[PDB]
Design a protein around this ligand. Structure first.
Ligand SMILES: CCCCCCCCCCCCCCCCCC(=O)OC[C@H](COP(=O)([O-])OCC(O)COP(=O)([O-])OC[C@@H](COC(=O)CCCCCCCCCCCCCCCCC)OC(=O)CCCCCCCCCCCCCCCCC)OC(=O)CCCCCCCCCCCCCCCCC
Ligand SMILES: CCCCCCCCCCCCCCCC(=O)OC[C@H](COP(=O)(O)O)OC(=O)CCCCCCCCCCCCCCC
Ligand SMILES: CCCCCCCCCCCCCCCC(=O)OC[C@H](COP(=O)(O)O)OC(=O)CCCCCCCCCCCCCCC
Ligand SMILES: CCCCCCCCCCCCO[C@@H]1O[C@H](CO)[C@@H](O[C@H]2O[C@H](CO)[C@@H](O)[C@H](O)[C@H]2O)[C@H](O)[C@H]1O
Ligand SMILES: COCCOCCOCCOc1ccc(C(C)(C)CC(C)(C)C)cc1
Lengths: 100, 63, 49, 96, 54, 81, 81, 81, 81, 81, 81, 81, 81, 81
């Protein structure tokens, strides 16, 4: 088939990576390296290995958003609600009458 | 010609599904005959990460 | 071979149903019957009375 | 009809109801495994999916902090703008 | 043999496949018989609605 | 079968535009005729007097076709309901 | 399946404009022929008499298709209900 | 799902408009074919005798295309309900 | 949601004109091939024999696309219900 | 709000006419290549052999677009219900 | 007020023909490039090597838009339900 | 009076097909520019370089108009709900 | 007679593909101006400087109509519901 | 007979695109005037002064029709419901 020629099914497997566990082991390796080397805070090693993590964590904990992002808290498609007058109320009363 | 004539006569008398379309009554009857499970709707559109690039998603509503 | 084939057919499926089926499935069933007769599992694989 | 507008429930209530729904969907799997008579390892293999879904809902709930009230956030409410009242630099605070 | 695709004989031939034409004839007769009744019923209903309102 | 007759009054005014779309096409034939007469006279001014009837002829025939199209659009409204 | 025959009277009129738009398409070939005769006359005045029979011919047959295209739309109305 | 067969009798005529719109297109190739014979004869009168078969051949095929389109338009109405 | 399948029998005949409209466009190319061959022969009579093979080639083969433009409209009616 | 799905079976064919209508527009470009080769050889016969490859190349490319347009028309009918 | 959502499935296959009508309109421009290259080399064969880049350059660009016109109609069917 | 709102989801695509039909018309202006460059270079090889900036300027803001049309047709689908 | 108002929301978009279909037809006029400039410079090289002021003016105002034609399609969507 | 009155509000915005399609059709005849002015200046630069009064006149009044076509679609929306 032409789409069969435009298809790539030469995969072998799925590599599963727990990036949380890998980040934890990376941080543990950084701590182990800094403890074994007994490096001070003014070292470029300590700076490179600590400062960006601390900065990003401090920013992500300081963030106080009055509203959440665009496609998560508003600008969402919603079906129009039933009105308390006109045809919707009549349908509601008819539903109540039929049910009861 | 024999094949298409037989298939057309069975499509006419509704013993066989039409060309390209899955028919409900015939599929349910064949499942009841073979004693197999009925053709359900196994898809899950509300599964995590299926319609994330969809600008017009589908809304959950308990019918 | 025809005699054994049609004996097996009339015993297992029936001559009327066999006539009603298609020539292809007829030939397939005839070939299966021929194999059963050539095998002769009941005679100890021997074409003797 | 339909309309493009604001979310109905707050984020916290939304995550709460999602966690309750996944709790229900996990409890049903557990009750079915108990009715079938499965052991611990088989119950694990059965309902690990709903367990992970519940854990992810719990992670989302724990991750979302509702906002704190202050003069900057109130002024941003009056201005009707999405504003972070914890940044002196804005978009560059991500890199500073 | 090559064109049939079968080595023994043709397929979809036989009284089992020929009878479907007569089955279709009977099915169409029944279908038209029921459709005439349904169409007459719906036409009577529509002529009632029209001669009552219009 | 059931017989439903409908009379779309809106179609009174659509076809008028559909004809009006084609009224402009003969104008190109008009200008082609006059352009031919101009370039021919510039090539040979003496022949101008001989081509003047043809010019008047070739316009009118082209113009007449436009008029017929235009007439339909005007005949579509002030007589039909 | 249910069978509803419908008769749309509005479609009696729509096609009139659609053919009317096609009445102007030959009008450019009209001047293409007359322009051809004009430029051939400026090419050779002495041959003007011998190409005129192909002028009136080359128009009228092209005009004939413009007539039939116009004929239908006029036949479309005063007989069809 | 539900199945409503409909037979629209107004659509017996809409196609005739579009066909009539396509009957006028070959008139351009008609005039271009007579024009080419005109100009080629003005450039070479002596060769005019043996280009006439080419001219009528081109015009007849082009007219046949117009005729076939017109034939569809006329067969669409006087036999179909 | 509800599902109403409809079978529009009028669309069996609507498309006939829609395809028919495109049958006359190739005529301009067809006549163009002869309008070229004429002028080429008027430029060089002696080369007329070597261009005639490439004069009927494009002639019939542009009409071949016209044929497939016409073969659909004829395949649209006398087989479809 | 309410939701009515509709499956118009007639639309299996209405597009086929349009796809068929667009097959004839490239035919003018098709014959434009043979016309160009004609006039080129009519101005320089000796170069006729070196331009013939370009002539065949252009015919195929112009013809391919018409041929590409045809695929939609044939793909629109024989598989879609 | 009342709200009826409708999903017209016929427009899946109508627009395919509506785009298919336009796929051939570039082809007449495509052939213009090679015709120009032919006649330019007929005026000056020695320049045929320096213009041939502009010939190939003139094709693939003019051809591209046709392809883009062809994309939508193929984007219209094999992804949308 | 009673208000019946409708949302036609098929109309998401018809315009896309129409715009797709319109994407091809600049393609003839591209080869028009490049054919002009060719004939200007064959007329005067020494002016080959001075008109090359115009050879690029003619294509850039001509293909752009084809892209704006193409931009609408693809913007018509992948953003509108 | 009873008043059935309908508000068709799909109609917000169909017109956008029509305006988009009309954004292309200026492009041939745009490239015509630079084609004229090229052949004019090949007719008179040193005049190329005094024609360029009369070349951008025809470029922008031909482009300007495309903008307004392009304006509607963008003004038809991002403000209308 | 029964009287069903309908007011289609979407047509108010469909006709905007329909008139928009015709806003660019003049643009070819807008740049054609300056194209002719270029070719005439190349023919006789001394005449360039005598022609530009008869250029701007033919320019603006070719542009004017586009304005009359554009104004409609802009008057179609901001006042009509
Ligand atoms: C820099 C100057 C040096 C800082 C002084 C040292 C210090 O301790 O910092 C105190 C002060 C509090 O910082 P914090 O105690 O570390 O953070 C706790 C909360 O953020 C505290 O949030 P908050 O609500 O208390 O914000 C207080 C805000 C003043 O807020 C208002 O007055 C808003 C009402 C405006 C009235 C009109 O800042 C001030 O008090 C003085 C600066 C103005 O620093 C700042 O707020 C930084 C202000 C720098 C300008 C950013 C924008 C200020 C106004 C934003 C209004 C809302 C945003 C609207 C959009 C427009 C944005 C431009
Ligand atoms: C460390 C790789 C572990 C492994 O065995 O992995 C083995 C796999 C190959 O497995 P398969 O060929 O059987 O699918 O290769 C990789 O995953 C290496 C990926 C290279 C790209 C990332 C850098
Ligand atoms: C330099 C040598 C480092 C080393 O030897 O580090 C040694 C450590 C050993 O960890 P373990 O004791 O868990 O095996 O390796 C790690 O922890 C992970 C290193 C990253 C390997 C993956 C590379 C792709 C990056 C994705 C992981 C997430 C980002 C982590 C930051 C890089
Ligand atoms: C050979 C090809 C592949 C080469 C890949 C090499 C990529 C190297 C760049 C690593 C980038 C570091 O980027 C860092 O990623 C981690 C997760 O990984 C993010 O970390 C985030 O997610 C993790 C888990 O997903 C949480 O535990 C963490 O609290 C959160 O901050 C950091 O916020 C980001 O700063
Ligand atoms: C750098 O790029 C510039 C960013 O562009 C901003 C996008 O344009 C502004 C759009 O913002 C809106 C959105 C909605 C509206 C409403 C709905 C209020 C307009 C309306 C009622 C006329 C439809 C007005 C402006």
């Amino acid at each position: 088939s032409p789409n069969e020629h435009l298809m790539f099914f030469d995969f072998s497997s799925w590599l599963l990576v727990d990036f949380g566990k890998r980040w934890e082991r990376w941080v543990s390796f950084k701590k182990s390296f800094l403890t074994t080397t007994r490096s001070p805070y003014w070292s470029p090693q300590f700076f490179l290995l600590t400062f960006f993590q601390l900065r990003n964590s401090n920013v992500k904990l300081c963030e106080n958003w009055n509203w959440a992002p665009k496609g998560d808290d508003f600008n969402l498609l919603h079906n129009s609600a039933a009105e308390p007058f006109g045809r919707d109320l009549k349908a509601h009363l008819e539903r109540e009458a039929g049910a009861k | 010609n024999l094949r298409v004539e037989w298939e057309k006569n069975m499509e006419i008398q509704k013993k066989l599904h039409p060309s390209g379309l899955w028919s409900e009554e015939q599929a349910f009857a064949a499942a009841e005959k073979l004693g197999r499970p009925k053709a359900g709707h196994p898809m899950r559109v509300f599964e995590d990460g299926y319609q994330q690039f969809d600008l017009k998603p589908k809304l959950f509503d308990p019918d | 071979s025809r005699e054994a084939i049609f004996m097996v057919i009339e015993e297992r499926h029936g001559w009327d149903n066999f006539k009603k089926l298609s020539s292809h499935q007829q030939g397939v069933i005839m070939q299966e019957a021929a194999q059963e007769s050539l095998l002769a599992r009941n005679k100890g694989e021997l074409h003797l009375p | 009809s339909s309309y493009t507008g604001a979310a109905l429930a707050p984020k916290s209530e939304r995550l709460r109801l999602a966690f309750e729904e996944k709790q229900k969907d996990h409890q049903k799997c557990i009750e079915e495994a108990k009715g079938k008579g499965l052991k611990k390892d088989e119950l694990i293999d059965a309902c690990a999916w709903t367990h992970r879904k519940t854990i992810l809902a719990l992670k989302d709930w724990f991750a979302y902090r509702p906002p704190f009230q202050d003069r900057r956030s109130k002024w941003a409410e009056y201005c009707s703008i999405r504003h972070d009242s914890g940044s002196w630099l804005g978009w560059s605070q991500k890199f500073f | 043999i090559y064109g049939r695709g079968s080595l023994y004989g043709y397929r979809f031939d036989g009284e089992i496949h020929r009878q479907e034409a007569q089955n279709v004839i009977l099915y169409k007769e029944k279908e038209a018989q029921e459709m005439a009744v349904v169409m007459e019923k719906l036409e009577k209903e529509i002529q009632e609605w029209l001669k009552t309102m219009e | 079968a059931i017989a439903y007759e409908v009379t779309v009054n809106g179609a009174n005014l659509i076809g008028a535009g559909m004809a009006a779309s084609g009224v402009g096409v003969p104008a190109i034939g008009v200008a082609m005729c006059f352009s031919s007469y101009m370039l021919a006279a510039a090539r040979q001014p003496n022949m101008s007097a001989k081509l003047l009837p043809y010019c008047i002829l070739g316009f009118a025939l082209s113009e007449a076709l436009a008029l017929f199209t235009l007439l339909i659009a005007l005949l579509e409204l002030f007589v039909f309901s």
